[PDB]
């Protein structure tokens, strides 16, 4: 379906288009918005507005000047426009922060020694390390595989 919206005031506002044999269909008023919703076959369609005695196009919307000086609006209705996620897709075309306390909370320090508490999603993939206690560096991080977690401890010399 297509949305034909006239913006601005008017006692009576009508949409005349190619799609309706240039008949005068009336638009429903909100405040300063006059709308008619109607589905029309994807392709080319010309329209115009009969707003209180005067025939105008929508200046903001695409026009088409005819061989006879006729200026009507135009609408190229796409397949892209009808499918939501394809439409949103085509539509899309200091000082340091303070360290959140959530990051200072470790699952290692806080049964089985190879079993740890489930972690806060927020402190996943962050690097944690132990002080270099003579030439050996200890690095650690918690990550998630499927619905399970693994805290990898690397013992690497320097």
């Amino acid at each position: 379906p297509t949305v034909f919206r006239w913006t601005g005031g008017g006692k009576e506002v009508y949409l005349s288009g190619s799609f309706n044999n240039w008949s005068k269909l009336p638009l429903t008023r909100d405040q300063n918005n006059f709308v008619a919703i109607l589905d029309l076959p994807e392709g080319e369609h010309q329209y115009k507005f009969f707003v209180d005695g005067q025939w105008t196009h929508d200046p903001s919307e695409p026009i088409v000047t005819s061989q006879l000086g006729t200026v009507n609006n135009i609408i190229q209705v796409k397949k892209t426009d009808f499918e939501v996620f394809d439409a949103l897709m085509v539509d899309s075309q200091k000082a340091p922060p303070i360290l959140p306390p959530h990051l200072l909370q470790v699952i290692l320090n806080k049964c089985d020694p190879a079993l740890l508490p489930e972690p806060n999603h927020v402190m996943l993939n962050h690097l944690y390390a132990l002080s270099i206690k003579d030439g050996v560096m200890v690095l650690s991080a918690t990550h998630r595989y499927k619905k399970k977690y693994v805290t990898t401890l690397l013992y690497k010399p320097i």
């Binding site: 699952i107 290692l108 089985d112 020694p113 190879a114 079993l115 740890l116 508490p117 489930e118 972690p119 050996v136 918690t142 990550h143 595989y145 499927k146 399970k148 977690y149 693994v150 805290t151 990898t152 401890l153 690397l154 013992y155 690497k156 010399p157």
Partner: protein, 267 residues
Amino acid sequence: YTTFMKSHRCYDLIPTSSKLVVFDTSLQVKKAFFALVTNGVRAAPLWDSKKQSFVGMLTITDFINILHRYYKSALVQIYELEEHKIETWREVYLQDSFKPLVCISPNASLFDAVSSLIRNKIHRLPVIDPESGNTLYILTHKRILKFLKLFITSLEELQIAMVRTTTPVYVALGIFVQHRVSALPVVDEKGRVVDIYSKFDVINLAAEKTYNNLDVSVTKALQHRLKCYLHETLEAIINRLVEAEVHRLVDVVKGIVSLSDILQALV
């Protein structure tokens, strides 16, 4: 029973949140075993920084192999252990005869996990995700026969390496090496079994830092801290094993039935 393992993925046995220790092959082999102890872990994958891949698994067996290969006396330090790297020793251990990294995937079935432990003569298997390369968790016999017991809703009918009380550690370590056995039952004055010295007991040397004296008796070693009969049912043998969380059960020794053996029958 056999079909059960052919279905469920390795991942199902992976714990909710677990720990995993990985040592770079370039780490000093003493610090390596010492770290296992401190991290409460019996085995650790080995990453080769140059090769950019997991090349192996450091285990307690590696400690037993180093100790026995280079124990001079209680008088002189095991210079070798005190200053070899993991890479230097894995070179020595596997000279012309080399063993690659054996592992399983999370997606792969539990049958592919039990058969690999047997087919490769190993007790610990690392579950590795191929989409990542990341080692996730080291799956074990005890872990598999735990879940195989959380689902179940004669011994002689179904169907040896020993050490004395006096026997020193060195000698026992030697037996573990030339036999390829996990635990060693202890015999007293007569053929009556009083205790059992396992590969696990060997890490208490690393823990207490007492490895530079293997001249001490197996009993003296065991001072820092279970059996079955043949007329008992195989299911009762399974029930008793896990209820005590052990690896094998043997008043005189006749045979020892292990977790790796029950898994060979149920496959």
